[PDB]
Every structure is written in structure tokens, then in C-alpha cells.
Amino acid sequence: PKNPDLRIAQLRFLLSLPEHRGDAAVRDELMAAVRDNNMAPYYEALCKSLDWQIDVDLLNKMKKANEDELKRLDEELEDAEKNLGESEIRDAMMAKAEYLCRIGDKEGALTAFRKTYDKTVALGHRLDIVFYLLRIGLFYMDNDLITRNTEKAKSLIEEGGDWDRRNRLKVYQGLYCVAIRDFK
Amino acid sequence: PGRIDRKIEFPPPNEEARLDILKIHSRKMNLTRGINLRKIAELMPGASGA
Amino acid sequence: DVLPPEADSSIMMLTSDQKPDVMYADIGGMDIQKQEVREAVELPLTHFELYKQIGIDPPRGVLMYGPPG
């Protein structure tokens, strides 16, 4: 999930940039890197790390478990279409692509989120998908992709009140306007 | 018995079901942090969803 | 050519000799209804922004009824 996902980006900063302070940061991140099925976001972090010469079986036990969750999606997509709900293939992995958003990179996320964006006729799932796109666009600092969906976020709140989606949203620009040097 | 295919009963809501009706309708209100909606839902002893 | 708007019925309540000059202090003992007609008619007329700010959808129209007199 993307909910503990920002502490990872702080600890990547805690790893590299304090140059002497790079011993306990490479341990407690690896305490969380080679568990919870993370594969993609730490190859160059391992290049900024030491050797760690035997990671091959450490990767193979995890890319298998990546495939295990991926193949039960491959076992879901034919049992959901046979006796259909509200497109329960998509509706299953509209919650399991955020796993694949954490596990894989943005490409498995972006082709599945824009898939399931057109599924739900109510914004109450759409506007929660948009909060996922905002959060990964902070990790990869997608300063041009956040400008798109923030307007696409804010265009959804006007119908309804959506204050748990507005006051939640104000923190995101509040962290973005302090990411850029815009203090007022 | 051959006339109506299925009859569906709607009960009055219970404590778990009064909470999420509050949860959906508190979406459009500008709230204050620290509310404990659980305590609010228990004060109504199952009135209705209206 | 386009026109300024117009009607015959009624015109606009001519505001000088048209108010029926009854004040709120004349109506004795209507504490709920004097208060609650305020929240539906003229309080969203002036303080429109708080209804917008809390988001509680101010009422469009109001139906008042009861026995005669």
C-alpha cells in the first residue's frame, strides 16, 4: 500500500546525503526493502549501498512472491468476467494495483489506474485514485504530472462537499508549496 | 407463491450500520479533528437511515 | 432588438406605500417559526458564504401551512 510509503522516501534521503551517516540507514531500510515484496525502487540505492554480493536468492524469493500475487490476478480475471459484477477483474485490482504501485513501478499503476478511472461512475472511488497518483508523483517528483491531476482532483470536489477529500487535499499542496520555495 | 420471485426485508440499522451511514453523510461536512463518531452513533438506538 | 425585462403582474412592490408595516414585535409567541423562517429565507440571503463554506445546501423554497388564522 501507499500509506507507509513516504517514510521510504525520507529514509532514502537519510541514506545517501549524510555521507558519514550511511550505516544504520542502509540497515533499517534493507530491514524494509527486502521484505514486503519491494523489487524495483532500490537497484541504484544498492549501487549507492555496498556490494551485498548475494542478493540473488534474496531477489528470487521475492520476485516469485511478486508473481504469486500477479498470477492469482491471472486466476481472478476469468472468474470475474464469467459471472460479472461491476467489472470485478478491474474492481479486484483497482485495490491491488496500489500493491503493484508499491511493488512495481508507475507503469503497472498508471495503466491500471486510468483503466479503473473509467469504471466507477461515482467520484468516491475516482477521487481516491487521484490521491494515489499525487503520492507517487511526489516520490518520483513528477512536477508536471501533479499539475494535471490536481486540477483533475479539484474539479471533482465541487459536486458534493468532500471535505475529507478537500482538507486532505490541502495538505498535499501544502507539502508541495513548501517543496517549491513558495512560503506564502 | 409463483407470483413474486424474491422478497427482500430491510431491517432498521444496528450500531455497526449507524456508523457508516454517518460516515457517508459526514463526507460533505467541514469537520473538526477529534469527533469519535462511534459515540454519536450509539446515542441513536436505531432510528432509521433517514 | 433585445429588450430590458418586463412584467405586469406584479411589478416590484413599489417600496414606499407598499410595506404592510407590521414589525416582528407584533407577532407574539411564535418563537420556533420566527427563528426558523430566518434560517431559510434571509439568513442565506445575506450570509451566503457560510452555507458555501460549511457546505450544507441552503433550501430553495419553503412551504408553510396549517389551520386558518
Coordinates of all heavy atoms in Angstrom, one line a residue, chain A residues 56-139:
Chain A
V56 N 20.8 -12.5 -4.9 CA 20.2 -13.2 -6.0 C 19.0 -14.0 -5.5 O 17.9 -13.9 -6.0 CB 21.2 -14.0 -6.8 CG1 20.5 -14.7 -8.0 CG2 22.3 -13.2 -7.3
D57 N 19.2 -14.9 -4.5 CA 18.2 -15.6 -3.9 C 17.3 -14.7 -3.0 O 16.1 -15.0 -2.8 CB 18.7 -16.8 -3.0 CG 19.3 -17.9 -3.9 OD1 18.8 -18.1 -5.0 OD2 20.3 -18.5 -3.4
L58 N 17.8 -13.6 -2.5 CA 17.1 -12.6 -1.9 C 16.1 -11.9 -2.9 O 15.0 -11.6 -2.5 CB 18.0 -11.5 -1.2 CG 18.5 -11.8 0.1 CD1 19.7 -12.8 0.2 CD2 19.0 -10.5 0.7
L59 N 16.5 -11.8 -4.1 CA 15.5 -11.3 -5.1 C 14.6 -12.4 -5.6 O 13.4 -12.2 -5.8 CB 16.3 -10.7 -6.3 CG 17.0 -9.4 -6.1 CD1 17.8 -9.0 -7.4 CD2 16.0 -8.3 -5.7
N60 N 15.1 -13.6 -5.8 CA 14.3 -14.7 -6.3 C 13.2 -15.2 -5.4 O 12.1 -15.6 -5.9 CB 15.2 -15.9 -6.7 CG 16.1 -15.6 -7.9 OD1 15.7 -15.0 -8.8 ND2 17.3 -16.1 -7.8
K61 N 13.4 -15.1 -4.1 CA 12.3 -15.4 -3.2 C 11.2 -14.4 -3.2 O 10.1 -14.6 -2.8 CB 12.8 -15.6 -1.8 CG 13.3 -14.3 -1.2 CD 13.8 -14.5 0.2 CE 14.4 -13.2 0.7 NZ 13.4 -12.1 0.9
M62 N 11.5 -13.2 -3.7 CA 10.5 -12.1 -3.7 C 9.9 -11.8 -5.1 O 8.7 -11.5 -5.1 CB 11.3 -10.8 -3.3 CG 11.8 -10.9 -1.9 SD 12.7 -9.4 -1.5 CE 11.4 -8.2 -1.4
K63 N 10.7 -11.9 -6.2 CA 10.0 -11.9 -7.5 C 9.1 -13.1 -7.8 O 8.2 -13.0 -8.6 CB 11.1 -11.7 -8.6 CG 12.0 -12.9 -8.7 CD 13.1 -12.7 -9.7 CE 12.6 -12.5 -11.1 NZ 13.6 -12.4 -12.1
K64 N 9.4 -14.2 -7.1 CA 8.4 -15.3 -7.1 C 7.1 -14.9 -6.4 O 6.0 -15.0 -7.0 CB 9.0 -16.5 -6.5 CG 8.1 -17.7 -6.5 CD 7.8 -18.2 -7.9 CE 6.9 -19.4 -8.0 NZ 7.6 -20.6 -7.3
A65 N 7.2 -14.3 -5.2 CA 6.0 -13.8 -4.5 C 5.4 -12.6 -5.2 O 4.2 -12.4 -4.9 CB 6.4 -13.5 -3.0
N66 N 6.1 -11.9 -5.9 CA 5.5 -10.9 -6.8 C 4.7 -11.6 -7.9 O 3.6 -11.1 -8.2 CB 6.6 -10.0 -7.5 CG 6.1 -8.8 -8.1 OD1 4.9 -8.5 -8.1 ND2 7.0 -8.0 -8.7
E67 N 5.2 -12.6 -8.5 CA 4.5 -13.4 -9.5 C 3.3 -14.1 -8.9 O 2.3 -14.3 -9.5 CB 5.4 -14.4 -10.2 CG 4.8 -15.1 -11.3 CD 4.4 -14.3 -12.5 OE1 5.1 -13.2 -12.7 OE2 3.5 -14.6 -13.2
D68 N 3.4 -14.5 -7.6 CA 2.3 -15.2 -6.9 C 1.1 -14.4 -6.8 O 0.0 -14.8 -7.1 CB 2.8 -15.7 -5.5 CG 3.8 -16.8 -5.6 OD1 3.8 -17.5 -6.6 OD2 4.6 -16.9 -4.7
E69 N 1.3 -13.1 -6.3 CA 0.2 -12.2 -6.3 C -0.2 -11.8 -7.7 O -1.4 -11.5 -8.0 CB 0.6 -10.9 -5.5 CG -0.5 -9.9 -5.2 CD -0.7 -8.9 -6.3 OE1 0.3 -8.6 -7.0 OE2 -1.8 -8.3 -6.4
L70 N 0.7 -11.9 -8.7 CA 0.3 -11.5 -10.1 C -0.4 -12.6 -10.8 O -1.2 -12.4 -11.7 CB 1.6 -11.1 -10.8 CG 1.5 -10.4 -12.2 CD1 2.7 -9.4 -12.3 CD2 1.7 -11.4 -13.3
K71 N -0.1 -13.9 -10.4 CA -0.8 -15.0 -11.1 C -2.1 -15.3 -10.5 O -3.0 -15.9 -11.2 CB 0.1 -16.3 -11.0 CG 0.3 -16.9 -9.7 CD 1.1 -18.1 -9.7 CE 1.3 -18.7 -8.4 NZ 2.2 -19.9 -8.4
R72 N -2.4 -14.9 -9.2 CA -3.8 -15.0 -8.7 C -4.7 -13.9 -9.2 O -5.9 -14.1 -9.2 CB -3.7 -15.1 -7.2 CG -3.2 -13.8 -6.5 CD -3.2 -14.0 -5.0 NE -4.5 -14.1 -4.5 CZ -5.3 -13.1 -4.2 NH1 -4.9 -11.9 -4.4 NH2 -6.6 -13.4 -3.8
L73 N -4.1 -12.8 -9.6 CA -4.8 -11.9 -10.5 C -5.0 -12.5 -11.9 O -6.1 -12.3 -12.5 CB -4.0 -10.6 -10.7 CG -3.8 -9.6 -9.5 CD1 -2.8 -8.5 -9.9 CD2 -5.1 -9.0 -9.2
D74 N -4.1 -13.3 -12.4 CA -4.3 -14.0 -13.6 C -5.2 -15.2 -13.4 O -5.7 -15.7 -14.4 CB -2.9 -14.5 -14.1 CG -2.0 -13.4 -14.5 OD1 -2.5 -12.3 -14.8 OD2 -0.8 -13.6 -14.4
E75 N -5.5 -15.6 -12.2 CA -6.6 -16.6 -11.9 C -7.9 -15.9 -11.5 O -8.9 -16.6 -11.4 CB -6.1 -17.5 -10.8 CG -5.0 -18.5 -11.2 CD -4.5 -19.3 -10.1 OE1 -5.0 -19.1 -8.9 OE2 -3.7 -20.2 -10.4
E76 N -7.9 -14.6 -11.3 CA -9.1 -13.8 -11.0 C -9.8 -13.3 -12.2 O -11.0 -13.3 -12.2 CB -8.7 -12.7 -10.1 CG -9.9 -11.8 -9.6 CD -10.8 -12.6 -8.6 OE1 -10.3 -13.5 -7.9 OE2 -12.0 -12.4 -8.7
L77 N -9.1 -13.0 -13.2 CA -9.6 -12.2 -14.4 C -10.5 -13.0 -15.3 O -11.2 -12.4 -16.1 CB -8.4 -11.6 -15.2 CG -7.3 -12.5 -15.7 CD1 -7.5 -13.1 -17.1 CD2 -6.0 -11.6 -15.8
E78 N -10.6 -14.3 -15.1 CA -11.5 -15.1 -15.9 C -12.7 -15.6 -15.1 O -13.8 -15.9 -15.6 CB -10.8 -16.3 -16.5 CG -10.4 -17.4 -15.5 CD -9.0 -17.1 -14.8 OE1 -8.6 -15.9 -14.8 OE2 -8.4 -18.1 -14.2
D79 N -12.6 -15.6 -13.7 CA -13.7 -15.9 -12.9 C -14.6 -14.7 -12.5 O -15.7 -14.9 -12.1 CB -13.2 -16.6 -11.6 CG -12.6 -17.9 -11.8 OD1 -13.0 -18.6 -12.8 OD2 -11.7 -18.3 -11.0
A80 N -14.0 -13.5 -12.8 CA -14.8 -12.3 -12.6 C -15.6 -11.9 -13.8 O -16.7 -11.3 -13.7 CB -13.9 -11.2 -12.2
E81 N -15.1 -12.3 -15.0 CA -15.8 -12.0 -16.2 C -16.9 -13.0 -16.6 O -17.8 -12.7 -17.4 CB -14.8 -11.9 -17.4 CG -14.1 -13.2 -17.6 CD -13.0 -13.1 -18.7 OE1 -12.9 -12.0 -19.3 OE2 -12.3 -14.1 -19.0
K82 N -16.9 -14.2 -16.0 CA -17.8 -15.2 -16.3 C -19.2 -14.9 -15.8 O -20.2 -15.0 -16.5 CB -17.4 -16.6 -15.7 CG -18.3 -17.7 -16.0 CD -18.3 -18.1 -17.5 CE -19.1 -19.3 -17.7 NZ -20.6 -19.1 -17.4
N83 N -19.3 -14.4 -14.5 CA -20.5 -14.0 -13.8 C -20.1 -12.7 -13.3 O -19.6 -12.6 -12.1 CB -20.9 -15.1 -12.8 CG -22.3 -14.8 -12.2 OD1 -22.9 -13.9 -12.6 ND2 -22.7 -15.7 -11.3
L84 N -20.5 -11.6 -14.0 CA -19.9 -10.3 -13.8 C -20.5 -9.5 -12.7 O -21.7 -9.6 -12.4 CB -20.0 -9.5 -15.1 CG -19.2 -8.2 -15.2 CD1 -17.7 -8.5 -15.3 CD2 -19.6 -7.4 -16.5
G85 N -19.7 -8.8 -11.9 CA -20.2 -7.8 -11.0 C -20.0 -6.5 -11.7 O -20.5 -6.3 -12.9
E86 N -19.4 -5.5 -11.1 CA -19.1 -4.2 -11.8 C -17.7 -4.2 -12.3 O -16.8 -3.4 -11.9 CB -19.4 -3.0 -10.8 CG -18.7 -3.0 -9.4 CD -19.5 -3.8 -8.4 OE1 -20.3 -4.7 -8.7 OE2 -19.2 -3.5 -7.2
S87 N -17.5 -5.1 -13.3 CA -16.2 -5.4 -13.9 C -15.2 -5.8 -12.8 O -14.2 -5.0 -12.5 CB -15.7 -4.2 -14.7 OG -14.4 -4.5 -15.3
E88 N -15.4 -6.9 -12.2 CA -14.7 -7.3 -11.0 C -13.3 -7.8 -11.2 O -12.5 -8.0 -10.3 CB -15.5 -8.5 -10.3 CG -16.8 -8.0 -9.7 CD -16.6 -7.1 -8.5 OE1 -15.6 -7.2 -7.8 OE2 -17.5 -6.2 -8.3
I89 N -12.8 -7.9 -12.5 CA -11.4 -8.0 -12.8 C -10.7 -6.7 -12.3 O -9.8 -6.7 -11.5 CB -11.2 -8.2 -14.3 CG1 -11.9 -9.4 -14.9 CG2 -9.7 -8.3 -14.6 CD1 -12.1 -9.3 -16.4
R90 N -11.1 -5.6 -13.0 CA -10.6 -4.3 -12.7 C -10.9 -3.9 -11.2 O -10.1 -3.4 -10.5 CB -11.4 -3.4 -13.7 CG -11.0 -1.9 -13.9 CD -11.9 -1.6 -15.1 NE -11.8 -0.2 -15.6 CZ -12.6 0.2 -16.6 NH1 -13.5 -0.6 -17.1 NH2 -12.5 1.5 -17.0
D91 N -12.1 -4.3 -10.8 CA -12.6 -3.9 -9.4 C -11.8 -4.7 -8.3 O -11.7 -4.2 -7.2 CB -14.1 -4.2 -9.3 CG -14.7 -3.5 -8.1 OD1 -14.0 -2.7 -7.4 OD2 -15.9 -3.8 -7.8
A92 N -11.2 -5.9 -8.7 CA -10.3 -6.5 -7.8 C -9.0 -5.8 -7.8 O -8.5 -5.4 -6.7 CB -10.1 -8.0 -8.2
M93 N -8.4 -5.6 -8.9 CA -7.1 -5.0 -9.0 C -7.2 -3.4 -9.0 O -6.1 -2.8 -9.3 CB -6.2 -5.5 -10.1 CG -6.8 -5.2 -11.5 SD -5.8 -5.9 -12.8 CE -6.2 -7.7 -12.6
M94 N -8.3 -2.8 -8.8 CA -8.3 -1.4 -8.5 C -7.9 -1.2 -7.1 O -7.6 0.0 -6.7 CB -9.7 -0.7 -8.7 CG -10.7 -1.1 -7.7 SD -12.2 -0.1 -7.9 CE -11.6 1.5 -7.4
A95 N -7.8 -2.2 -6.3 CA -7.2 -2.1 -4.9 C -5.9 -2.9 -4.9 O -5.1 -2.6 -4.0 CB -8.2 -2.8 -3.9
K96 N -5.6 -3.7 -5.9 CA -4.4 -4.5 -5.9 C -3.4 -3.9 -6.9 O -2.2 -4.4 -6.9 CB -4.7 -6.0 -6.3 CG -5.3 -6.7 -5.1 CD -5.7 -8.1 -5.4 CE -7.0 -8.2 -6.1 NZ -8.1 -7.8 -5.3
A97 N -3.7 -2.9 -7.7 CA -2.7 -2.2 -8.4 C -1.9 -1.2 -7.5 O -0.8 -0.9 -7.9 CB -3.3 -1.4 -9.6
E98 N -2.5 -0.8 -6.4 CA -1.8 0.0 -5.5 C -0.7 -0.8 -4.8 O 0.3 -0.2 -4.3 CB -2.7 0.7 -4.4 CG -3.5 1.8 -4.9 CD -4.8 1.3 -5.6 OE1 -5.0 0.1 -5.7 OE2 -5.6 2.1 -6.2
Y99 N -0.9 -2.1 -4.6 CA 0.1 -3.0 -4.3 C 1.2 -3.0 -5.4 O 2.3 -2.7 -5.2 CB -0.5 -4.4 -4.1 CG 0.5 -5.5 -3.7 CD1 1.0 -5.6 -2.4 CD2 1.0 -6.4 -4.7 CE1 1.9 -6.6 -2.1 CE2 1.9 -7.4 -4.3 CZ 2.4 -7.5 -3.0 OH 3.3 -8.4 -2.7
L100 N 0.7 -3.2 -6.6 CA 1.6 -3.2 -7.8 C 2.2 -1.8 -8.0 O 3.2 -1.6 -8.7 CB 0.9 -3.6 -9.1 CG 0.3 -5.0 -9.0 CD1 -0.5 -5.3 -10.2 CD2 1.5 -6.0 -8.9
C101 N 1.6 -0.7 -7.5 CA 2.2 0.6 -7.5 C 3.3 0.6 -6.5 O 4.4 1.2 -6.8 CB 1.1 1.6 -7.1 SG 1.7 3.3 -7.1
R102 N 3.2 0.0 -5.3 CA 4.3 -0.1 -4.4 C 5.3 -1.1 -4.9 O 6.6 -0.8 -4.8 CB 3.8 -0.5 -3.0 CG 4.9 -0.5 -2.0 CD 4.4 -0.9 -0.7 NE 5.5 -0.9 0.3 CZ 5.3 -1.1 1.6 NH1 4.1 -1.4 2.1 NH2 6.3 -1.1 2.5
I103 N 4.9 -2.2 -5.4 CA 5.8 -3.3 -5.8 C 6.5 -3.0 -7.1 O 7.8 -2.8 -7.1 CB 5.1 -4.6 -5.8 CG1 4.5 -4.9 -4.4 CG2 6.0 -5.7 -6.3 CD1 5.3 -4.6 -3.2
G104 N 5.8 -2.9 -8.2 CA 6.3 -2.5 -9.4 C 6.5 -1.0 -9.4 O 6.3 -0.3 -8.4
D105 N 6.8 -0.4 -10.6 CA 7.0 1.0 -10.8 C 5.6 1.6 -11.2 O 4.6 0.9 -11.1 CB 8.1 1.3 -11.7 CG 9.5 1.1 -11.1 OD1 9.6 1.4 -9.8 OD2 10.4 0.7 -11.8
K106 N 5.7 2.8 -11.7 CA 4.5 3.6 -12.0 C 3.7 3.0 -13.2 O 2.5 3.2 -13.3 CB 4.8 5.0 -12.3 CG 5.7 5.2 -13.5 CD 6.2 6.6 -13.7 CE 7.0 6.7 -15.0 NZ 8.3 6.0 -14.8
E107 N 4.3 2.2 -14.0 CA 3.7 1.8 -15.3 C 2.6 0.8 -15.1 O 1.5 0.9 -15.7 CB 4.8 1.2 -16.2 CG 5.8 2.2 -16.8 CD 7.0 2.4 -15.8 OE1 7.0 1.7 -14.8 OE2 7.8 3.3 -16.1
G108 N 2.8 -0.2 -14.2 CA 1.7 -1.0 -13.7 C 0.6 -0.3 -13.0 O -0.5 -0.7 -13.1
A109 N 1.0 0.8 -12.3 CA 0.0 1.7 -11.7 C -0.8 2.5 -12.7 O -2.0 2.5 -12.6 CB 0.7 2.5 -10.6
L110 N -0.1 3.2 -13.6 CA -0.7 4.2 -14.4 C -1.6 3.6 -15.5 O -2.6 4.2 -15.8 CB 0.4 5.1 -15.1 CG 1.4 4.6 -16.1 CD1 0.9 4.8 -17.5 CD2 2.7 5.3 -15.9
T111 N -1.3 2.4 -16.0 CA -2.2 1.8 -16.9 C -3.3 1.1 -16.3 O -4.3 0.8 -16.9 CB -1.4 0.8 -17.8 OG1 -2.2 0.4 -18.9 CG2 -1.1 -0.5 -17.1
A112 N -3.3 0.8 -15.0 CA -4.4 0.2 -14.2 C -5.2 1.3 -13.5 O -6.4 1.0 -13.4 CB -3.9 -0.8 -13.2
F113 N -4.7 2.4 -13.2 CA -5.5 3.4 -12.5 C -6.3 4.2 -13.6 O -7.5 4.4 -13.3 CB -4.6 4.4 -11.8 CG -3.9 3.8 -10.6 CD1 -2.8 4.4 -10.0 CD2 -4.4 2.7 -10.0 CE1 -2.2 3.9 -8.9 CE2 -3.8 2.1 -8.9 CZ -2.7 2.7 -8.3
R114 N -5.7 4.5 -14.7 CA -6.5 5.0 -15.8 C -7.5 4.0 -16.4 O -8.4 4.4 -17.1 CB -5.6 5.6 -16.9 CG -4.9 6.9 -16.4 CD -4.1 7.5 -17.5 NE -3.4 8.7 -17.1 CZ -2.2 8.8 -16.4 NH1 -1.6 7.6 -16.2 NH2 -1.7 9.9 -16.1
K115 N -7.2 2.7 -16.2 CA -8.2 1.7 -16.5 C -9.4 1.9 -15.6 O -10.4 2.3 -16.1 CB -7.6 0.3 -16.3 CG -8.6 -0.8 -16.6 CD -8.0 -2.2 -16.5 CE -9.0 -3.3 -16.6 NZ -9.6 -3.3 -18.0
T116 N -9.2 1.8 -14.3 CA -10.3 1.8 -13.3 C -10.8 3.2 -13.1 O -11.8 3.3 -12.3 CB -9.8 1.1 -12.0 OG1 -11.0 1.0 -11.2 CG2 -8.8 2.0 -11.3
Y117 N -10.3 4.2 -13.7 CA -10.9 5.5 -13.5 C -12.2 5.6 -14.3 O -13.1 6.2 -13.8 CB -9.9 6.6 -14.1 CG -10.4 8.0 -13.9 CD1 -10.4 8.6 -12.7 CD2 -10.9 8.7 -15.0 CE1 -10.9 9.9 -12.6 CE2 -11.4 10.0 -14.9 CZ -11.4 10.6 -13.7 OH -11.9 11.9 -13.6
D118 N -12.3 4.9 -15.4 CA -13.5 4.9 -16.2 C -14.5 3.9 -15.8 O -15.6 3.9 -16.3 CB -13.2 4.7 -17.7 CG -12.4 5.8 -18.3 OD1 -12.5 7.0 -17.8 OD2 -11.6 5.6 -19.2
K119 N -14.1 3.1 -14.8 CA -15.1 2.0 -14.3 C -16.1 2.7 -13.4 O -17.3 2.6 -13.7 CB -14.3 0.9 -13.6 CG -15.2 -0.2 -13.0 CD -14.4 -1.3 -12.4 CE -13.8 -0.8 -11.1 NZ -14.9 -0.6 -10.0
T120 N -15.7 3.3 -12.3 CA -16.6 3.7 -11.3 C -17.3 5.0 -11.7 O -16.6 6.0 -12.1 CB -15.8 4.0 -10.0 OG1 -14.9 5.1 -10.1 CG2 -15.0 2.8 -9.6
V121 N -18.6 5.0 -11.7 CA -19.4 6.1 -12.1 C -19.5 7.2 -11.1 O -19.9 8.4 -11.4 CB -20.8 5.7 -12.5 CG1 -20.8 4.7 -13.7 CG2 -21.6 5.1 -11.3
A122 N -19.1 6.9 -9.8 CA -19.1 7.9 -8.8 C -17.6 8.3 -8.5 O -16.7 7.4 -8.6 CB -19.7 7.4 -7.5
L123 N -17.4 9.5 -8.2 CA -16.1 10.0 -7.9 C -15.5 9.5 -6.6 O -14.2 9.6 -6.4 CB -16.1 11.6 -7.8 CG -17.0 12.2 -6.8 CD1 -16.3 12.7 -5.5 CD2 -17.7 13.4 -7.4
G124 N -16.3 8.9 -5.7 CA -15.8 8.4 -4.4 C -14.8 7.3 -4.5 O -14.1 7.1 -3.5
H125 N -14.7 6.6 -5.6 CA -13.5 5.8 -5.9 C -12.5 6.5 -6.8 O -11.3 6.3 -6.7 CB -13.9 4.5 -6.5 CG -14.7 3.6 -5.6 ND1 -14.1 3.0 -4.5 CD2 -16.0 3.3 -5.6 CE1 -15.0 2.3 -3.8 NE2 -16.2 2.4 -4.5
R126 N -13.0 7.4 -7.7 CA -12.2 8.1 -8.6 C -11.2 9.1 -7.9 O -10.0 9.0 -8.1 CB -13.0 8.9 -9.6 CG -13.9 8.2 -10.6 CD -14.3 9.3 -11.6 NE -15.3 8.8 -12.6 CZ -16.6 9.0 -12.6 NH1 -17.1 9.6 -11.5 NH2 -17.4 8.6 -13.5
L127 N -11.8 9.9 -7.0 CA -11.0 10.9 -6.3 C -10.1 10.2 -5.3 O -9.1 10.9 -4.9 CB -12.0 11.8 -5.6 CG -11.5 13.1 -5.0 CD1 -10.9 14.0 -6.0 CD2 -12.8 13.8 -4.5
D128 N -10.3 9.0 -4.9 CA -9.3 8.3 -4.1 C -8.2 7.7 -5.0 O -7.1 7.5 -4.5 CB -10.0 7.2 -3.3 CG -10.9 7.8 -2.2 OD1 -10.6 8.9 -1.8 OD2 -11.8 7.1 -1.7
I129 N -8.5 7.4 -6.2 CA -7.4 7.0 -7.2 C -6.5 8.2 -7.4 O -5.3 8.0 -7.5 CB -8.1 6.4 -8.5 CG1 -8.7 5.1 -8.2 CG2 -7.0 6.2 -9.6 CD1 -7.8 4.1 -7.6
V130 N -7.1 9.4 -7.5 CA -6.3 10.6 -7.8 C -5.3 10.9 -6.7 O -4.2 11.3 -6.9 CB -7.2 11.8 -8.1 CG1 -6.4 13.0 -8.4 CG2 -8.1 11.4 -9.3
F131 N -5.7 10.6 -5.4 CA -4.7 10.8 -4.3 C -3.6 9.8 -4.4 O -2.5 10.1 -3.9 CB -5.5 10.5 -3.0 CG -6.4 11.6 -2.7 CD1 -7.5 11.4 -1.8 CD2 -6.3 12.9 -3.3 CE1 -8.4 12.4 -1.4 CE2 -7.2 13.9 -2.9 CZ -8.2 13.7 -2.0
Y132 N -3.7 8.7 -5.1 CA -2.6 7.7 -5.3 C -1.7 8.3 -6.4 O -0.4 8.2 -6.2 CB -3.2 6.4 -5.8 CG -4.0 5.7 -4.7 CD1 -5.1 5.0 -5.0 CD2 -3.7 5.9 -3.4 CE1 -5.9 4.4 -4.0 CE2 -4.4 5.3 -2.4 CZ -5.6 4.6 -2.7 OH -6.3 4.0 -1.7
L133 N -2.2 8.9 -7.4 CA -1.4 9.5 -8.5 C -0.6 10.7 -7.9 O 0.5 11.0 -8.4 CB -2.2 9.9 -9.7 CG -2.6 8.9 -10.8 CD1 -3.6 7.9 -10.4 CD2 -3.0 9.7 -12.0
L134 N -1.2 11.4 -7.0 CA -0.5 12.5 -6.4 C 0.7 12.0 -5.6 O 1.8 12.6 -5.6 CB -1.4 13.3 -5.5 CG -2.5 14.1 -6.2 CD1 -3.4 14.8 -5.2 CD2 -1.9 15.1 -7.1
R135 N 0.5 10.9 -4.9 CA 1.5 10.5 -3.9 C 2.7 9.8 -4.6 O 3.8 10.1 -4.1 CB 0.8 9.5 -2.9 CG 1.7 9.2 -1.8 CD 0.9 8.2 -0.8 NE -0.3 8.9 -0.3 CZ -1.5 8.4 -0.5 NH1 -1.7 7.4 -1.3 NH2 -2.6 9.1 0.0
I136 N 2.5 9.1 -5.6 CA 3.7 8.6 -6.4 C 4.4 9.7 -7.1 O 5.6 9.7 -7.3 CB 3.2 7.4 -7.3 CG1 4.4 6.8 -8.0 CG2 2.1 7.9 -8.3 CD1 4.1 5.5 -8.7
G137 N 3.6 10.7 -7.6 CA 4.2 11.9 -8.3 C 5.0 12.8 -7.4 O 5.7 13.7 -7.9
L138 N 5.0 12.6 -6.1 CA 5.9 13.2 -5.1 C 7.2 12.3 -4.9 O 8.3 12.9 -4.8 CB 5.2 13.3 -3.8 CG 6.0 14.1 -2.7 CD1 6.3 15.5 -3.1 CD2 5.2 14.0 -1.4
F139 N 7.0 11.0 -5.0 CA 8.2 10.1 -4.9 C 9.1 10.3 -6.0 O 10.4 10.4 -5.9 CB 7.7 8.7 -4.8 CG 6.9 8.4 -3.5 CD1 5.9 7.5 -3.6 CD2 7.1 9.1 -2.4 CE1 5.2 7.3 -2.4 CE2 6.4 8.9 -1.3 CZ 5.4 8.0 -1.3

